[PDB]
């Protein structure tokens, strides 16, 4: 029984597939309708092939014959070749996101704010013109009727604004704030020593988790908000019917 | 013994030559392994930055939406003024509503001012106390606060959610009762 | 960059401006905030 074991060992260490003992199958993904192709080749036992297809992880996968080490090396070769492609595409995505963010964070924000202020200014001008129109043309001395109500409202709000107390409260508040300003700044300068305790005390790990929990909350909150929004928009419909 | 002693040499040499390939596999693993492990961390990162942009753009939508309806009413209010002058060169009862409208609008803005003022009072009154304790006193203790906050927000959200669901279902009830 | 945008938005939020209504809101936090949450 000696020259049999030897031949069997010589057979084991070989790509000829006489019980190669390095028989493992790897599933290569292939989209339909290419499944009908592949289609093994020289020394494939339909037993192994079907048994591979039997315990299939997901559809559109075809098994691949990995006999020994050069094959697994090759599989690695491919894996790197795809690694680089993955990283590249990912970087593309990254770059386009940077572009979008650069646009928004600078080019668009400024134009939004600027446009809003321009609107306010033009609103003022619009009311000014819309006011002078009601002056020069309507200077026929016959200005009355609904004017009384207008000047009544105007007088009410104007009287409400032009009050000593209401106007005084702000002035009192400001100084009332400056008191705390000075007091706080003094008490702060006094206790302006605990810096390392503060910086190191704050810098931690729970902060990262808290950020995550915050994002989750934000998502939940957004969802709820939009849900209510829809609940409103969907109700004002029923309000008509 | 020649053929045998030579055959064993060739065989053992071939096997050893195969084990060299096995080793070649073993060598090219850890690097590639790191490279592989790197991927999910980046895609799990880039997916986050995308969410940032989306939350940013989506926030940018409402900005224009506001700016859209603003210029449109300013377009009309600036248009209602010229048609009055163009009518003159060759609506007085209409602008009254506009002025009284601006008045009615501002009438609440003043109330907002009052509200915010009262809040500011109520707030600074607290600032006083905070400083009044901070002067009196003169890391790990506050970490508990954060948790105590978040675990409470969970509850508050879960509280609100019920209200929301109740409303929504309450609306669908009427919606149903309509075509039912 | 999400939380960053949340900060940035909540940063630009409490900082003006001339928008005919929306003035910057004062931030609280921690002690006052918990009670302010409970008073919901």
């Amino acid at each position, epitope marked *: 029984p000696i020259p049999e074991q030897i031949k069997l060992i010589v057979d084991k260490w070989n790509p000829n597939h006489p019980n190669c003992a390095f028989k493992t199958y790897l599933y290569n993904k292939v989209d339909e309708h290419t499944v009908p192709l592949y289609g093994p080749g020289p020394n494939e036992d339909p037993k192994e092939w079907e048994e591979a297809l039997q315990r299939k992880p997901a559809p559109n996968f075809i098994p691949v014959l990995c006999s020994g080490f050069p094959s697994i090396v090759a599989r690695l070769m491919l894996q790197r070749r795809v*690694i*680089t492609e993955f*990283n*590249n595409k*990912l*970087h*593309q995505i*990254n*770059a386009s996101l*940077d*572009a979008i*963010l*650069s646009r928004h*964070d*600078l080019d668009h924000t400024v134009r939004a704010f600027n446009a809003r202020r321009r609107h306010a200014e033009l609103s003022r001008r619009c009311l000014h013109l819309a006011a002078r129109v009601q002056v020069l043309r309507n200077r026929g001395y016959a200005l009355s009727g609904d004017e009384d109500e207008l000047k009544q409202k105007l007088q009410q709000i104007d009287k409400t604004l032009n009050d000593p107390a209401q106007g005084s409260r702000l002035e009192e508040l400001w100084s009332r704030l400056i008191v705390l300003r000075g007091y706080a700044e003094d008490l702060k300068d006094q206790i302006n020593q605990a810096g390392i305790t503060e910086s190191d005390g704050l810098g931690e790990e729970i902060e990262a988790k808290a950020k995550k929990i915050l994002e989750d909350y934000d998502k939940q909150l957004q969802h709820l908000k939009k849900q209510v929004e829809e609940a409103k928009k969907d109700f004002e419909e029923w309000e008509k019917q | 013994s020649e053929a045998l002693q030579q055959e064993i040499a060739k065989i053992d040499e071939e096997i050893q030559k195969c084990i060299r390939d096995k080793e070649a596999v073993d060598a090219f693993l850890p*690097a590639h392994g*790191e*490279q592989l492990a*790197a991927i999910p*961390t*980046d895609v799990n*990162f*880039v997916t986050r*930055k995308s969410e940032g942009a989306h939350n940013a753009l989506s926030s940018d939508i409402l900005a224009i939406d506001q700016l859209r309806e603003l210029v449109k009413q300013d377009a009309d209010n600036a248009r209602l003024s010229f048609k009055a002058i163009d009518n003159l060169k060759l609506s007085n009862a209409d602008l009254i509503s506009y002025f009284s409208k601006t008045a009615d609008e501002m009438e609440e803005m003043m109330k907002k001012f009052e509200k915010t003022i009262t809040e500011i009072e109520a707030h600074l009154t607290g600032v006083e106390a905070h400083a009044m304790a901070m002067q009196n006193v003169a890391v790990d203790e506050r970490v508990y606060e954060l948790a105590a906050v978040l675990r409470e927000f969970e509850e508050s959200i879960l509280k609100v959610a019920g209200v929301v669901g109740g409303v929504k279902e309450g609306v669908t009830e009427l919606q149903l009762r309509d075509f039912m | *960059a999400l939380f*960053d945008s949340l900060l940035a938005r909540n940063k630009k939020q409490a900082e003006g401006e001339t928008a005919l209504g929306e003035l910057p809101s004062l931030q609280l936090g921690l002690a006052d905030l918990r009670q302010r949450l409970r008073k919901l």
Partner: antibody
Amino acid sequence: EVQLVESGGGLVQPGGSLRLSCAASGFNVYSYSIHWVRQAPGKGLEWVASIYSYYGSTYYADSVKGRFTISADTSKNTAYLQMNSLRAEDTAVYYCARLTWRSYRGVHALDYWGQGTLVTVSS
Amino acid sequence: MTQSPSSLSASVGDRVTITCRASQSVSSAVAWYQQKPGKAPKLLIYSASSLYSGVPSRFSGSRSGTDFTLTISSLQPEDFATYYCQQSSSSLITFGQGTKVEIKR
């Protein structure tokens, strides 16, 4: 759709002062960290200084500590290298660059360089 | 101590391999760069071994202990330029002496 425009270089007397400007286009400067790297004529590359705004960190090479001062305007979205107490040995072509997608971990590599500006210090 | 690179040379299509030895063996953070005369530096390899986007496959970076290596399996008429490595120790980015390759004849 990404570039680094470099300016502010040129001629200057010894012991003088300059402010190099690296205007970045295609990405927020705050999100990334920007680096300066000069190259002396006929010599190799020399790292000068780094700035990352979102962290608020600044780092300088031994050969320019205290003398130089890097910064960056987030609103203008531009980096600046303030050079003081210059010497004849500071004569070099100054380049500006950035790191990989954010940091991201500890993957320090300069992907996008500019075309650089030549700073000549001579009497 | 700004230094100039060691100018080596070889014929076209020769298998070239360049090596830098970091005083502090690093985890990753070792970039390799190419630079042609008059033109700024460009990135080749990053994270020691990860090839960068927009780089031919003939460039292949690797590591062996404390020594990092840039391999060009086939030198091309466009591969004639100066090559630098980069150490990074958080921080103080250090550039190697560099290495210029020239066509042999």
